[PDB]
Structures are given as C-alpha cells and as structure tokens.
Design an enzyme around this catalytic site. Structure first.
Site, PDB file in Angstrom:
ATOM      1  CG  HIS A 150      -1.558  -3.374   3.288  1.00  0.00           C
ATOM      2  ND1 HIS A 150      -2.729  -3.531   2.719  1.00  0.00           N
ATOM      3  CD2 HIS A 150      -1.474  -4.330   4.274  1.00  0.00           C
ATOM      4  CE1 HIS A 150      -3.332  -4.538   3.315  1.00  0.00           C
ATOM      5  NE2 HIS A 150      -2.547  -5.024   4.256  1.00  0.00           N
ATOM      6  CD1 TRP A 156       1.471  -8.419   0.548  1.00  0.00           C
ATOM      7  CD2 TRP A 156      -0.233  -7.826  -0.778  1.00  0.00           C
ATOM      8  NE1 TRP A 156       0.634  -7.737   1.269  1.00  0.00           N
ATOM      9  CE2 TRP A 156      -0.387  -7.361   0.518  1.00  0.00           C
ATOM     10  CE3 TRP A 156      -1.182  -7.560  -1.735  1.00  0.00           C
ATOM     11  CZ2 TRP A 156      -1.483  -6.629   0.908  1.00  0.00           C
ATOM     12  CZ3 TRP A 156      -2.299  -6.833  -1.376  1.00  0.00           C
ATOM     13  CH2 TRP A 156      -2.442  -6.369  -0.068  1.00  0.00           C
ATOM     14  CE1 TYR A 178      -3.813 -11.381  -5.531  1.00  0.00           C
ATOM     15  CE2 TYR A 178      -5.911 -12.438  -4.977  1.00  0.00           C
ATOM     16  CZ  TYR A 178      -5.181 -11.331  -5.380  1.00  0.00           C
ATOM     17  OH  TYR A 178      -5.833 -10.138  -5.592  1.00  0.00           O
ATOM     18  CD  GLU A 192       0.561  -7.707   5.174  1.00  0.00           C
ATOM     19  OE1 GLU A 192       1.134  -8.046   4.138  1.00  0.00           O
ATOM     20  OE2 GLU A 192      -0.675  -7.446   5.197  1.00  0.00           O
ATOM     21  CE  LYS A 205      -2.826 -16.174   6.618  1.00  0.00           C
ATOM     22  NZ  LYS A 205      -3.093 -16.241   8.042  1.00  0.00           N
ATOM     23  CG  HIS A 206       1.594 -11.695   1.852  1.00  0.00           C
ATOM     24  ND1 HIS A 206       0.840 -12.128   0.854  1.00  0.00           N
ATOM     25  CD2 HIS A 206       0.754 -10.988   2.666  1.00  0.00           C
ATOM     26  CE1 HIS A 206      -0.383 -11.711   1.022  1.00  0.00           C
ATOM     27  NE2 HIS A 206      -0.427 -11.021   2.115  1.00  0.00           N
TER      28      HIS A 206
END
Length: 222
Positions: free
Chosen positions: A46, A49, A57, A105, A108-109
């Site tokens: 997935h 992160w 986060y 992905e 954002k990460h």
C-alpha cells in the site's frame, strides 16, 4: 567521502545532514491482503510512509509541492521498465487506477523522504528520486515477507486463525510487533515500523499499535 552509517534515526546519533539521516525518522511499511490483486503467496504494497519520531504524521499534503506529480506511471515506465512491471504485480491499486494510486503515494509520502531530495544526488537526472523511492519500498516488501512469516508457523490462506496466533508469528519471525488490521473480521493490512541506520538501512521496531484484528480472523485465498 561518506554517509555516516551508525547514525540511527530517532536517537542521540542521527546526523543533521538530512541527506544521510531521514528527517521523518520513523517509517511504516503498509502491506495488504487484497483478494484479486497480486500473487497468491504475497501481500502487496500500500505504501512506505515517513512519520515523525513521536509517530505523528508528516504534512498531509506531502512535503514538496514542487515535486508533487499526477503522472507517476509514465515517469516510471520511461526511467525503468522492470520496476514498472514489478509494480503491476506487487503494488496494484485495489481500485483499478494505478497511476492515481502511485501519484498519491509519491506526492504525499515520497516527497517526505529527505535522502532522495534532488540536492542529495551529486549528479542528478530527473526522476532519479522517484525510482529510488519506489524501488526501496518494493525491496522492503520482498525482504519482509509476511506471507512466509505466517506459513512457516502454519497460517496459510483459506482458514480462520486467531489474531493472537497471527501476532506471535509476525513477532517470532521478525522480532517485533506489527499492526494487523481487519475489516469485518477478515485480514486486510499488516504494517511494520522502522528506524533507519545510516542513509537507508531499515531496522525494525515495534508497531506503535497492534491494530484492529481481534478474535478469529479470516485469512481468505487471493
């Protein structure tokens, strides 16, 4: 000459050069068991992160807007055909739109891993950072085979197991607790937490939560 390798993120020894020690020092590898996606004998990815050392986060919109992208499938396809092909097998979008999934992905990460910032490459060519990141995650999903951890302790697809025996298999095989999540009592995701030693050697550590699986969990066939 060097990137200080005993440096451990989230400790008194992380060197301040964010090109040699990740700025978001705690990283979680999130893998899922989606029936109909990937090989029968493997969890697919997935995402990888980066998080703060307290587990907080990173910015929800990623960490580098100038580097955000909505075309990640053609960037990987052109820089590396093999990496693109491995992703179709091990990083499928369970919602039938790979490019939107991979672009999210990365944006954002991926932008939040400071060792892949373009200023860290002494001779950078466009798309280098993106491929390093997708390749590092694919490697980790391979190296941390959760399907092998379960099978070796007798947990195979198409059975009902207890969440408790599932955690002991992950714990004994890797030496750390993972976050095992369920949806309606069916296994859906497994996440492993890490620290980084030097630029990118991942060292596992205990999940900051055991997850939503409790009781008897169904592990379906893919």
């Amino acid at each position: 000459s060097s990137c200080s390798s005993t440096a451990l993120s989230c400790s008194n020894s992380a060197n301040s050069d964010t090109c040699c020690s990740p700025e978001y020092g705690l990283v979680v590898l999130n893998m899922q068991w989606a029936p109909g996606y990937g090989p029968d004998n493997a969890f697919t990815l997935h995402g990888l992160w980066p998080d703060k050392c307290s587990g907080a986060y990173a910015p929800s919109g990623g960490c580098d807007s100038n580097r955000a992208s909505s075309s990640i499938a053609s960037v990987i396809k052109s820089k590396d055909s093999s990496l693109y092909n491995s992703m179709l097998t091990y990083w499928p979008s369970n919602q039938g739109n790979n490019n939107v999934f991979w672009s999210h992905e990365w944006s954002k990460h991926g932008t939040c891993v400071s060792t892949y910032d373009p200023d860290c490459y002494d001779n950078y060519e466009e798309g280098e950072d993106i491929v390093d990141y997708f390749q590092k995650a694919m490697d980790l999903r391979s190296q941390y085979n959760v399907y092998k951890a379960f099978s070796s302790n007798g947990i195979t697809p198409g059975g009902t197991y207890t969440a408790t025996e599932m955690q002991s298999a992950i714990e004994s095989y890797f030496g750390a607790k993972a976050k095992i999540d369920c949806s309606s009592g069916t296994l859906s995701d497994v996440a492993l937490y890490f620290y980084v030693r030097g630029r990118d050697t991942y060292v596992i550590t205990d999940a900051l939560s055991t997850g939503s699986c409790s009781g008897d969990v169904e592990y379906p066939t893919k």
